[PDB]
Paper text:
Thiopeptides are a class of sulfur-rich, highly modified peptide antibiotics that are active against various drug-resistant bacterial pathogens. Dehydration of this residue at the early stage in the nosiheptide biosynthetic pathway generates enamide, and subsequent dealkylation requires the activity of [name], which has recently been characterized as a new terminal amide synthase, leading to a Cα-N bond cleavage for nosiheptide maturation with release of the co-product pyruvate.
This dimeric structure adopts a global fold, resembling an elliptic β-barrel of 28.9 Å in height, with diameters of 15 Å and 23 Å. However, the enzymatic assay performed on the HPLC system indicates that NosA1-111 has no catalytic activity, revealing that the C-terminal loop NosA112-151 is extremely important to the catalytic reaction.
Residue numbers in the entry:
A (entry chain C): 6 to 35, 42 to 103
B (entry chain B): 8 to 35, 43 to 104
C (entry chain A): 7 to 105
The structure:
Amino acid sequence: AQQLYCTVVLWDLSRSAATVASLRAYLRDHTVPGLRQKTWISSTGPEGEQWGAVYLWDSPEAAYGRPPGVSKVVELIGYRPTERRYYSVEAA
Amino acid sequence: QLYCTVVLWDLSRSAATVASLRAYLRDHVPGLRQKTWISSTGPEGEQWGAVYLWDSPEAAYGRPPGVSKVVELIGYRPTERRYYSVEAAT
Amino acid sequence: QQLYCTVVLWDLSRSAATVASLRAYLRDHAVDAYTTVPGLRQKTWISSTGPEGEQWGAVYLWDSPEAAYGRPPGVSKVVELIGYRPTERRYYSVEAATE
């Protein structure tokens, strides 16, 4: 309701033929209960390419649920997310 | 086209905890769309952080605003910085 | 000398209440700093979070074994905030405690 909970899900794309470009295109071509906000993010650098999603939830349980719209990205990239983090929103 | 920067502190080396920073917070800029404080607890360790939403990559690379006070509260600069392009948002 | 520890817990997953919201209410409505109930040495509110699931609870230190098994005192407001009675009760003997 007022306290929000954040889940961050990240894929390192070093071990995948998918890139930020290819995944941006699949997003271009191709309302969940409890979910206030869903954001797709990316990063490029010497470290390598990364794809991810940031979820704002209105309940603590949902934050640990299987993240929505991840199954489709899993088969596109080739594997389970390399990183997953859990936060509380303290002030926005 | 928006950009997202996140600044984090591992709190294990500070007297500060998520709880004490939360309490302090409770009792107390060009290009910047949104500023959000975040925290993390559990077996992996305590963290405090700020998430910024920018509309330019320059401002995003600029030194994070409103971080000065927190650096004083924790006792050191952020231990981790990450930089993202926003691809899509609801 | 012999003390008895009763722990009552609420699983919060079925409730609109959360650790954050219970903690916020507590912050704006301070509980008694001292014990009122005869035989009650100490009362502590506790919480847990993370993948296991959210929980709220009360830990009681009693000087008699009868009270340890009675209805736990001072939980009426929390029961109203959560919307149900404790989902779990545990009974312990204190075998040794540091001072």
